[PDB]
Design a protein around this ligand. Structure first.
Ligand SMILES: [Ca+2]
Ligand SMILES: [Ca+2]
Ligand SMILES: [Ca+2]
Ligand SMILES: [Ca+2]
Ligand SMILES: [Ca+2]
Ligand SMILES: [Ca+2]
Ligand SMILES: [Ca+2]
Ligand SMILES: [Ca+2]
Ligand SMILES: [Ca+2]
Lengths: 496, 450, 500
């Protein structure tokens, strides 16, 4: 075991089967290393840069890279890749917020039930975190025509795993479908450095200010739509070591690698609700028989990309459960088609057990409130008539629904002018009971549900209107006995 | 031995344990070296730049770096890191309207910065007036630590160019300035260089950019700030990654970190900066949420129950605010106004002696030596073996404070937050009462934010 | 020996002790070399550049550097450092400039000095780049005449030991507190060459016109009218140094002097010598106090002065181009920290001389030679002769004294003094009987009288007197004693210029 075909100081056999770096030397992987904290790395023995990034497999695995790079990008399959966008703080004035997911979720259709095996949803307008949508937070029904009777505050963000140096973004002013001009940061709106999961200017500093609109767009802006600001391209550099040991970011353009990484990877986005992450994971092309990129499943990709913890069987991200049945998976058309085609040949019927291919797009939307009756409950109020003396749950226990259960959801906790979906898993062994669900919202809707012998997922939509309004009431009425588990509420796009 | 994994001219065995530099070559540490002035250095044996700065462990330890770098940054665990800001001295508006301001750059780090080009924000109330970047006319060639540009004894430089003349667009914001508002100045980013010696021996600061190292240093270190009331120092000390078994960064406590970072002397047990006590009980410690949580979690597993014995961790933020007036009844008393009901015959103090109080203590503080319109706190430690007396405070301030405190069997610290407003207002009255006989020690007064 | 730790072509044993360069190679020092004119060099054996300048110890000692560098900087302990400032000599909406006014404005003169410390203390110690100009065109009229409700003439100067190439000063144009604008030479006010002790343009050339138009307020105009204290601050200067290359050519292109300014200022002590007309600024390297690995040699203050200013030691007293610059023959001015260090260090010395105190890092020293000084031994530069002088004595401070019994008068014409300037009259007196008394009278703009009592040994006394106008009464100084008194080393030193 001494061959090095790609010449990156890792033997072919070790890199094919499994290796780890100890004392700056690659060693064969042994299962006893897991408790000591070492991780099992695998990469391609024919290419020195498996993920397509500036750093080779040895440099990533051994940590011999910039120390500002996230520890997730030390896996050869996870690329070091900045994701820089621009978000609007104020416009001129009234305070506004921004969302990196609304454009992705605006085009998802929610149905009452889900088909066999497949659990996630399908979007028609999949977008990345660089697309940003503005939402006015200081609106009280007034229009923008008042006052005038007829600059801009921005703050760059990084959702990638690598820092970008000398950031020069280019953004388009989208007048709800119209473009004034393309604007490029000339000399004073350049960020010298922008670490992952941080903004420029840093938190605690005033939003950046950079140096007109017609009544037709004012009428559009006043009625139901808000301006959006998205980046067409960003130019920046990366750091590498000299022969004298210095770090240089000059001539090291990130644009030399944008196209290569994007074409050998699969895009995955995780949205915790407060902070958002976007990762690229390398995959192999199907036709080529000389492509030696390791093949891993979707759950392994999630664990490697987001450094989730495998506490038993379910993955946990900083304590938040991100398991297949605890989140809302959103794919585009092609990825959903591939997953559905691959699921019929798999007896497990799990999305996370499906092999990861290049070109797939996955979005994970973590619920705002989720309960599983085992260890996790973050609902603002406790559900009524909770039964836990059962051992027939989806994972550990379930809820023995016999009668009526209600939940009190204050309007203050939920963001106004937003679209939500209520989801959960239900099972009825007798297959002779009916479920009636009523949601109290701006519009009251009544829907009937027929559970099956095994666990199935249901979903119902509702919207919240107005900061000052009535509470939200959800009730579950059962004719007989119904098994309930893994109830959750996720936040979809905003509404006019 | 002679094994050098990282190739930085220090053997791995020497780095794992202590080592020191004698005659520009590394040697094993011996306890007899401390009496001759030599210092004990420990660093990671798997990396050449433990702290993340442009200088390796051997260069820092042996002093083979720029001589303008402070001696604190000669320790491999303390980073050589400039902290450059801008401070506004005068503000001028005149005629539309032309804005000129008088500023002066500051450096609170351990390394000089060359060719300083700061960027600062002009904000009056949330809204940024403009983003200003210095031009060739107002770039500082040299900015040494603990020094300003221009140096002391020179007039502050004026900033009135935006290459041009700066001019606000609308007048409503300028008119709102008179409506009880002010202009704020904060530093967004600063450009600059560091010196390295080339193959001919000359110092070069041309291709060397400090921005190539900001993200890396800020990511592998902990931030500590020491404020003595007159001059402020900000330091970065390297810490290890929690989940990495291959991270060989040495692990040190908070007191060791402070001693290394600020070159504080230690006479037996206490820590002195320049004769100013900076001990755990002699200053005010301020932490953010995460650092406070880590410290509280780690304290319950430690018998001594001291902040300075808690292991330093990556990402922690510590602020040390040295009290302006501090007395310990032993060797230091700069209080302008004497106390009441004082009996100095005791031996049950925190370090040497204490003060015997029987009843209540009230202090009338003259405000002549006090800076107007600043929040203050009066702090100290109290002892009560009986655990049967209650302590309450009667405080005269903007909002009158009446709170209750229960002394413990051992020494306990009392500090109550209050806001003082009005120079031409009523005198500040502070009253504290105890039911029985109590022992009090380490009394101090500290300025805070206003 | 042969060991060379720092790789600068001089053995460590040679650097720890003295050494000298003969035939471009270092040799061990011998006491007999002083006759041939050779000098004894010491440097740090762990450092190539002891002084912190771009030139190593061997390059400095062997003289293999730019030939425009003064022989003072041939010593490895004396840094090759340019001190470039801007001076103004013409006002446009005829003028002299003093480079040691900010230092002497804050010095307070007292009659008596504590035993051992025969020096003064300043409050606003500044360097020769901080320059103040005094207008002499006005004879009593204000600037408001003629115009009521932009290009000035300047000339750079160098008081260092190294030439500056491609000089680009950044002068701070501050009138009184308020800074109107900060300006910097761009293309036509850049000096290609500026040798030490030289100006740009040269002495026989007209001053260059300073660079659009800057508004001037009116209140500051009458502020100048009340008192003329216009200042011309130089915040920074850009320039290059010359070094040889592989071809053998002198190169001054990427050789920025700013790469070395912070390093030199951090490992050295600043000393300024003012010789009445010309002013010199030097930097001498010193050691770190708490560093066992710092091998910089330790020298005293007198040794540092002799090394830095190339003074000649004629016996035991230092001489600078004939002018005596000994401790008792000049006016030493320190700042607070240097003064307290010297005061602490004197009480552990038997001799109790400032020149015997070890030089330390961060020290600031200013030397101002008196305008008129006599010692009754060989030097007497007063325009007139002191009356009632008894040269035949042996109890003098160095050789002889002035046996005083009665009254002493000196005539001093006003044309020999610069008007509107604060002055100091100083000397040493001693009375073995410890019973007589001395009274003095100074005839100046104010009639001031002070009393003085001598001691068993010599004790310096200092008194103030000012001048006003070019046409006024002559300055008369009276020395009156009851019994017999010994006087020696009488001097008059010119301090700052008083406001109009
Ligand atoms: Ca390989
Ligand atoms: Ca490979
Ligand atoms: Ca469950
Ligand atoms: Ca090593
Ligand atoms: Ca090391
Ligand atoms: Ca005590
Ligand atoms: Ca040598
Ligand atoms: Ca040497
Ligand atoms: Ca004499």
């Amino acid at each position: 075991e001494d061959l090095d075909t790609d010449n990156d100081n890792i033997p072919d056999a070790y890199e094919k089967n499994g290796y780890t770096i100890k004392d700056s030397i690659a060693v064969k992987w042994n299962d006893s290393f897991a408790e000591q904290g070492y991780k099992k790395y695998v990469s391609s023995y024919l290419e020195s840069n498996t993920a397509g990034d500036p750093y080779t497999d040895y440099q990533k695995a051994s940590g011999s890279i910039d120390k500002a790079i996230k520890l997730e990008a030390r896996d050869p399959l996870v690329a070091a890749y900045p994701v820089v966008g621009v978000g609007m703080e104020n416009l001129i004035s009234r305070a506004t917020t921004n969302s990196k997911t609304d454009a992705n979720t605006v085009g998802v259709s929610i149905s009452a039930g889900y088909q066999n095996g497949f659990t996630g949803n399908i979007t028609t307008s999949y977008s990345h975190t660089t697309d940003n949508s503005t939402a006015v937070q200081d609106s009280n029904g007034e229009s923008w025509n008042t006052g005038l009777s007829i600059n801009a505050n921005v703050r760059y963000y990084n959702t990638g795993t690598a820092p970008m140096y000398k950031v020069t973004p280019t953004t388009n002013l989208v007048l709800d479908g119209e473009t004034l001009a393309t604007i490029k940061a000339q000399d004073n709106q350049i960020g010298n450095n922008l670490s992952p999961n941080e903004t420029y200017p840093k938190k605690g500093l005033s939003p950046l200010a950079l140096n007109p609109i017609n009544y037709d767009q004012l009428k559009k802006l006043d009625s139901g739509k808000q301006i959006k600001l998205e980046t067409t391209q960003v130019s920046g550099n990366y750091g590498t070591k000299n022969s004298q040991g210095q770090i240089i970011t000059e001539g090291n353009s990130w644009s030399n690698y944008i196209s290569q990484i994007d074409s050998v990877s699969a895009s995955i986005i995780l949205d915790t609700g407060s902070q958002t992450f976007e990762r690229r994971v390398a995959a192999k092309e199907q036709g080529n028989p000389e492509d030696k990129t390791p093949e891993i499943t979707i759950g392994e990709a999630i664990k490697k990309a987001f450094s989730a913890t495998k506490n038993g069987e379910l993955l946990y991200f900083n304590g938040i459960p991100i398991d297949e049945s605890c989140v809302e998976l959103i794919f585009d058309d092609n990825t959903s088609e591939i997953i559905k085609e691959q699921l019929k040949y798999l007896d497990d019927k799990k999305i996370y057990n499906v092999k990861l291919e290049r070109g797939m797009n996955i979005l994970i939307k973590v619920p705002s409130y989720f309960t599983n009756f085992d260890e996790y409950n973050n609902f603002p109020a406790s559900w009524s008539n909770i039964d836990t003396k059962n051992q027939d749950g989806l994972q550990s226990v379930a809820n023995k629904l016999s009668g009526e259960t209600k939940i009190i959801i204050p309007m203050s906790k939920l963001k106004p002018y937003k679209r939500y979906v209520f989801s959960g898993y239900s099972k009825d062994p007798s297959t002779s009971n009916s479920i009636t669900v009523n949601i109290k919202s701006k519009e009251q809707k009544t829907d009937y549900l027929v559970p099956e012998k095994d666990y199935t997922k249901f979903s119902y939509e509702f919207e919240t209107t107005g900061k000052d309004s009535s509470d939200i009431e959800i009730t579950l009425t059962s004719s007989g006995v119904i098994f309930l588990d893994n109830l959750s509420i996720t936040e979809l796009n905003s509404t006019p």
